[PDB]
Amino acid sequence: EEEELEELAKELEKILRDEEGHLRKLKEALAEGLGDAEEAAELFRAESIDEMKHAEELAKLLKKGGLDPELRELLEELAELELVAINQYREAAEAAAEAAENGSEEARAAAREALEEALALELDGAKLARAALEAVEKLL
């Protein structure tokens, strides 16, 4: 029982580190304004694939048995948070792609709102991965 929790705790550690990374790169784009719209559009598309990997690992562990009821709910909440983040990453990438081709002032503000909304979802993603890793550490 201990070594299936250890591997699981290794997973939240990777997810937690990846979330803390996306946090900083997102404010960096926020600091640079739009900068190169292609920069943000290429960055969003890559990080949505990162959240892709996270939700897939969690679902495989969610199919496992013997999980503590409270631990399963935190993983279920995180997996839900990942799918909504993959959404907002796509809405922000398309708004940055429309701003790159057009120079549109509306596609600019729309890419910034979707950037800011993706940032708020990333704060709670790291917070949920922190609380989940803390619960597993208590079980160990």
Author numbering: 1 to 140
What do the authors of the reporting publication say about this deposited model?
The binding and catalytic functions of proteins are generally mediated by a small number of functional residues held in place by the overall protein structure. We describe deep learning approaches for scaffolding such functional sites without needing to pre-specify the fold or secondary structure of the scaffold. We use the methods to design candidate immunogens, receptor traps, metalloproteins, enzymes, and protein-binding proteins, and validate the designs using a combination of in silico and experimental tests. Unlike classical protein design pipelines, which treat backbone generation and sequence design as two separate problems, our methods simultaneously generate both sequence and structure, taking advantage of the ability of RosettaFold to reason over and jointly optimize both data types.
This ability to recover both sequence and structural information provides a second solution to the functional site scaffolding problem: given a functional site description, a forward pass through the network can be used to complete, or “inpaint”, both protein sequence and structure in a missing/masked region of protein. Di-iron sites are important in biological systems for iron storage and can mediate catalysis. We were able to recapitulate the di-iron site from E. coli bacterioferritin, composed of four parallel helical segments, to sub-angstrom AF-RMSD using both inpainting and hallucination (the latter were not tested due to buried polar residues). The designs had diverse helix connectivities and low structural similarity to the parent (TM-score 0.55–0.71 to 1BCF_A).
